[PDB]
Design an enzyme around this catalytic site. Structure first.
Site, mmCIF file in Angstrom:
data_model
loop_
_atom_site.group_PDB
_atom_site.id
_atom_site.type_symbol
_atom_site.label_atom_id
_atom_site.label_comp_id
_atom_site.label_asym_id
_atom_site.label_seq_id
_atom_site.Cartn_x
_atom_site.Cartn_y
_atom_site.Cartn_z
ATOM 1 N N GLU B 351 0.807 -1.214 0.000
ATOM 2 C CA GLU B 351 0.000 0.000 0.000
ATOM 3 C C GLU B 351 0.843 1.269 0.000
ATOM 4 O OE1 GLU B 351 -0.822 0.096 4.843
ATOM 5 O OE2 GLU B 351 -2.283 -0.824 3.486
ATOM 6 N N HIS B 481 -15.023 -11.658 -10.833
ATOM 7 C CA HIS B 481 -14.772 -10.626 -11.830
ATOM 8 C C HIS B 481 -15.532 -10.849 -13.131
ATOM 9 C CE1 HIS B 481 -11.397 -8.886 -9.492
ATOM 10 N NE2 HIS B 481 -11.200 -10.138 -9.119
#
Ligand SMILES: *[C@@H]1O[C@H](CO)[C@@H](O)[C@H](O)[C@H]1NC(C)=O
Ligand SMILES: *[C@@H]1O[C@H](CO)[C@@H](O)[C@H](O)[C@H]1NC(C)=O
Ligand SMILES: [Zn+2]
EC number: 3.4.17.23
Lengths: 193, 591
Positions: B351, B481
């Site tokens: 991150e 997805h």
């Protein structure tokens, strides 16, 4: 310093500090004071210099727009909102102003433009609100194709980052024209024997 | 003309888009910090107002001409704004397109198939990965497939028909070509890049990716015969439920089953993060000191005040989803369930890459506050965790002494799992991408859907099904997805992007050692090499982006093999008595 309302980047007001004694070289009231760069005058020689006319340019800009206020640079504010001359005599003072101007509902009180027909004049005041006629299309009060409103507002937030925060800048620019000076510096060295 | 007139329209759009996007992102962050009705009532209206403002600003931009604009700096911005999509057709289409997407999402979220039975996320992989019984996964594969296949096939076919109908409104061939249009580049004769030729580049990359995966898939088949003797083919394929996952894209639990040398585990720093006095705050301090050491600016003062690093136990509804949220206005914050574990260390270093990326392109307007494509967004996070995963970095942190003896087998078993968790999903991705590219344009009709799906699954991936399935099922639409609107071409490109960026940062630092263990610790040269790359963002295309990274402007499969160099020769020397290839005739149901 303790004003409850400041002006915009183009509609800034001008006040004359005269007929009173000023306390220079000691002006740190807030903690950060990220910008205390002066041009032509030393920071420790402000008390022993008398003045007659001193204007205060108060405007609110972003963090990346603080460096654009300098003689010899070009950006978005230094060409259409406010620009200092090349031989500028004064000092630039800025601080952090994300505390008392924090509202997540929306900040549509301050306005600023980004387009004009030509460059700015040193110490120019522009309050016109005509339509930007750039191409060869006449505008008669139309919002859209080739006609827009040049005035837009800010989007200040309490979490505006570290290099974009709203910097309320007060320019302490003095005018010297071999006039009788009235603003004297602090003179306190009394010791009688 | 409208040379300088377009400069005003986009600056008027983005000036208020920066305001409203933050009003929406703050409500989203507040809904993520606690899931209540008062936060959702504020988030829904903000999202609706933002979506309405986007269309109100895009409805009048279509009247402006595009081919007469000369300055490319605004041509790159204007082409991204006209991508409206559902603004061409009426509202009745958009209503019935959403009322079925919500229905299918609620159906997939409530998947309950029994005949010890749980929901979707509850007890999903804990039975697939942890349990090693064959009969435990026999039903867990078949029922999971049949509960969402036959109940979603009539709903997904009409959805694909609507996706194809949406292509004629914006002058597209199919819906798959719309997601390929994000990898767009315009400019001079050497800067243009067509959006339809991507199939050829993916095929060229896969033709070189396959020789790396052949031995890796052949070696894991020999050792799995010690547990499933009558279920593992000698020279054929492997079952789909024997891959540790219902799809075979995350072979994380297969590491203890495919361990090279079980006499010594991998590196372990979880116990050292407890007795030395480590907390959640000091990990980010050292991560940021490692990030600044290459020549990066410091963090925001509010990053340590508003970011929820430690999880409070005062009644807050925590979602615990590690993702670097870009709220806008230069605001950098992290919502993460931080602890002292190594799994939380990898994502904490991942991150920070996204944070330092978003810090770079904050100077450009809101329209250019994105990457050059969909592959540069989440690719800068993995290179930092790869550089931090070296044992020398952990020894420089201060956990283990400098007298650590790093052996070659440790690096071998590390690269094994690092490949099985990264390059193991490349064939699975390519197969479904080619399937979608074939069925969206109209190359494969609906009368040979499942037959072609299984043919491609057997040919590309090399996985055989244990029981025969007819064409009445809808197995490929059972993925997260694939059901909803989520692009998947980005994950295939990010795997190459990370290994390209790592090698480009390691070559510029003049490091003549191992590439897979190269570190950017105390390297001021790579910092300026990365800043000019991340600073352009969406202003410059990927063609001009890669030229300042490595110099080339095309996909390179050379780093894919140059990273796992000790692994390719290892698999070659260990497959001296094994058959390299695949068989499309063998099947477990061939009674
Ligand atoms: C979110 O919900 C909490 C709990 O009621 C409330 O205190 C907070 O003000 C809400 N936030 C917003 C932005 O409405
Ligand atoms: C940077 O400093 C020294 C360089 O001699 C060494 O410990 C290592 O390369 C770096 N240190 C850390 C903590 O990353
Ligand atoms: Zn990646």
């Amino acid at each position: 310093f303790n004003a409850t309302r400041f002006a915009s980047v183009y509609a800034w007001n001008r006040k004359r500090i005269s007929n009173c004694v000023a306390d220079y070289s000691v002006l740190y009231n807030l903690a950060p004071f990220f910008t205390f760069k002066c041009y032509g005058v030393s920071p420790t020689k402000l008390n022993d210099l008398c003045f007659t006319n001193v204007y205060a340019d108060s405007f609110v800009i972003r963090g990346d727009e603080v460096r654009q206020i300098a003689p010899g640079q070009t950006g978005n504010i230094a060409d259409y909102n406010y620009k200092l001359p090349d031989d500028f005599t004064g000092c630039v003072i800025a601080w952090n102003s994300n505390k008392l101007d924090s509202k997540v509902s929306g900040n549509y009180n301050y306005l600023y433009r980004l387009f004009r027909k030509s460059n700015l004049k040193p110490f120019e005041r522009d309050i016109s609100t005509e339509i930007y006629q750039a191409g060869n299309k006449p505008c008669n009060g139309v919002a859209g194709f080739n006609c827009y409103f040049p005035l837009r507002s800010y989007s200040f937030r309490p979490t505006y980052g570290v290099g974009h925060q709203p910097y309320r800048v007060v320019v302490l620019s003095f005018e010297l024209l071999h006039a009788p000076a009235t603003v004297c510096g602090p003179k306190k060295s009394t010791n009688l024997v | 003309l409208t040379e300088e007139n377009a400069k005003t329209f986009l600056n008027n759009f983005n000036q208020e888009a920066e305001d409203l996007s933050y009003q929406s992102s703050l409500a989203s962050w507040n809904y993520n910090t606690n899931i209540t009705e008062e936060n959702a009532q504020k988030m829904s209206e903000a999202a609706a107002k933002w979506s309405a403002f986007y269309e109100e600003q895009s409805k009048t931009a279509q009247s402006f001409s595009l081919q007469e604009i000369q300055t490319p700096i605004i041509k790159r911005q204007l082409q991204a704004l006209q991508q409206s999509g559902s603004s061409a057709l009426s509202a009745d289409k958009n209503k019935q397109l959403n009322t079925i997407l919500n229905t299918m999402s609620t159906i997939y979220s409530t998947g309950k198939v029994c005949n010890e039975c749980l929901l979707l996320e509850p007890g999903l992989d804990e039975i697939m990965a942890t349990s090693t019984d064959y009969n435990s996964r026999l039903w867990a594969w078949e029922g999971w497939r049949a509960e969402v296949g036959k109940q979603l096939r009539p709903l997904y076919e009409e959805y694909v028909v609507l996706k194809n109908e949406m292509a004629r409104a914006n002058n597209y061939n199919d819906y798959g070509d719309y997601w390929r249009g994000d990898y767009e580049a315009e400019g001079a004769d050497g800067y243009n890049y067509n959006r339809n030729q991507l199939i050829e580049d993916v095929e060229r990359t896969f033709a070189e990716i396959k020789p790396l995966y052949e031995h890796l898939h052949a070696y894991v088949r020999r050792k799995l015969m010690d547990t499933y003797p009558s279920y593992i083919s000698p020279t054929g394929c492997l079952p789909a439920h024997l891959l540790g996952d219902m799809w075979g894209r995350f072979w994380t639990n297969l590491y203890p089953l495919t361990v090279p040398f079980a006499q010594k585990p991998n590196i372990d720093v979880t116990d050292a993060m407890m007795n030395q006095g480590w907390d959640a705050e000091r990990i980010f301090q050292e991560a940021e000191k490692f990030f600044v050491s290459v020549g990066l600016p410091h963090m925001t003062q509010g990053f340590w005040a508003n970011s929820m690093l430690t999880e409070p136990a005062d009644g807050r509804k925590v979602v615990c989803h590690p993702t670097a949220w870009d709220l806008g206005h230069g605001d950098f914050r992290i919502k993460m369930c931080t602890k002292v574990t190594m799994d939380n260390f990898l994502t904490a270093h991942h991150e920070m890459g996204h944070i330092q990326y978003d810090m770079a392109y904050a100077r450009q307007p809101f329209l250019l506050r994105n990457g050059a494509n969909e592959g540069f967004h989440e690719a800068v996070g993995e290179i930092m965790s790869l550089s931090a995963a070296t044992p020398k970095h952990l020894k420089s942190i201060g956990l283990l002494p400098s007298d650590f003896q790093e052996d070659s087998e440790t690096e071998i078993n590390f690269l094994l799992k690092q490949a099985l968790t990264i390059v193991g999903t490349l064939p699975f991705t390519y197969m479904l991408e080619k399937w979608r590219w074939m069925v969206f344009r109209g190359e494969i009709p609906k009368e040979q859907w499942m037959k072609k799906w299984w043919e491609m699954k057997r040919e590309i991936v090399g996985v055989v099904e244990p029981l025969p399935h007819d064409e009445t099922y809808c197995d490929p639409a059972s993925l997260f997805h694939v059901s909803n609107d989520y692009s998947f071409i980005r994950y295939y490109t990010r795997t190459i992007y990370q290994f390209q960026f790592q090698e480009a940062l390691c070559q510029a630092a003049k490091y003549n050692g191992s590439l897979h263990k190269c570190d950017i610790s105390n390297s001021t040269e790579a910092g300026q090499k990365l800043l000019k790359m991340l600073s352009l963002g969406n202003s410059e295309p990927w063609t001009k982006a890669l030229e300042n990274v490595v110099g080339a402007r095309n996909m390179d499969v050379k780093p894919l093999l140059n990273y796992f160099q000790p692994l390719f020769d290892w698999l070659k020397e260990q497959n001296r008595n094994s058959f390299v290839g695949w068989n499309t005739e063998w099947s477990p149901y061939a009674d």
